[PDB]
Every structure is written in C-alpha cells, then in structure tokens.
Amino acid sequence: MVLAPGASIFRCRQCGQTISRRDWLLPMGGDHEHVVFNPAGMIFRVWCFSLAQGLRLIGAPSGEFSWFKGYDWTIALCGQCGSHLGWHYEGGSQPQTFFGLIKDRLAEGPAD
Ligand SMILES: O=C1CC[C@H](N2C(=O)c3ccccc3C2=O)C(=O)N1
Numbered sequence: 001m002v003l004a005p006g007a008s009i010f011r012c013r014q015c016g017q018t019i020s021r022r023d024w025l026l027p028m029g030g031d032h033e034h035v036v037f038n039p040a041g042m043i044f045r046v047w048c049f050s051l052a053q054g055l056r057l058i059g060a061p062s063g064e065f066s067w068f069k070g071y072d073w074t075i076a077l078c079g080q081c082g083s084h085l086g087w088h089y090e091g092g093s094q095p096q097t098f099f100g101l102i103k104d105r106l107a108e109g110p111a112d
C-alpha cells in the first residue's frame with residue numbers, strides 16, 4: 001500500500017527482538033486497545049494482536065483475573081531479554097488464542 005513504511009513492525013523496547021506487526025492488530029470487542037488494571041493496581045494499555053513471535057510463554061495458563069472473558073492467560077516475556085511484554089490468551093472462542101501486549105513496552109518501526 002505504501003513505500004518504505006515506518007510503522008510496520010513492533011520490537012521489544014529494551015532489546016530490539018522482533019515481536020509483532022501492525023498488520024496483526026486484532027480488534028477484540030471492537031477495539032485493538034484495552035486499558036486494564038491488575039490486582040497490584042498497575043494500569044496497562046494493552047494492544048491485542050492475532051500473532052506474535054520472539055516471546056517466551058511462562059507457566060501454565062490461568063483464568064484468574066482475566067481481562068478477556070473466556071480466556072486463560074500466560075505471562076509473555078521477551079524471549080531475548082526477559083522484559084515482560086504482555087500475555088498470551090488461550091482457551092476461548094473466536095479467536096481461540098491471541099496476544100495482549102503492553103504498548104509502551106514495544107517500539108514501532110520499519111519492516112525487516
Ligand atoms: O488478564 C490478565 C493477565 C494477568 C493480570 N495480572 C497481573 O498482571 C498480576 C500481577 C500480580 C498478581 C496477579 C496478576 C494478574 O492476574 C491480570 O490481572 N489479568
């Protein structure tokens with residue numbers, strides 16, 4: 001669609017690991033962005049993606065405190081540097097799985 005796009009790929013902000021792409025943004029409940037808080041009171045602006053790479057999913061899934069009805073989550077770390085980038089969601093419906101990534105922990109930039 002455009003030549004030399006600068007808003008193509010999302011990398012880990014801390015190390016540059018390739019994580020996702022703007023093309024893979026997923027409008028869960030009508031919006032790719034969901035503003036949420038955890039039990040420790042931390043607020044996250046979470047962007048939902050159909051796909052991601054370069055992460056390491058830690059532990060078994062849990063349904064507790066899930067921000068997305070019908071989904072269980074696993075912590076998603078940057079597979080390169082260990083930065084906590086978000087969560088992988090599974091066990092739900094349409095889609096069965098997706099990633100919720102913390103927007104401000106990613107850097108956006110040109111394709112590879
Ligand atoms: O969908 C989710 C993902 C996990 C997230 N969450 C956290 O970020 C957290 C931090 C410490 C203890 C417990 C939790 C927890 O469930 C949360 O609250 N909802």
Ligand SMILES: [Zn+2]
Nearest residue numbers: 012015078081
């Ligand atoms: Zn990283």
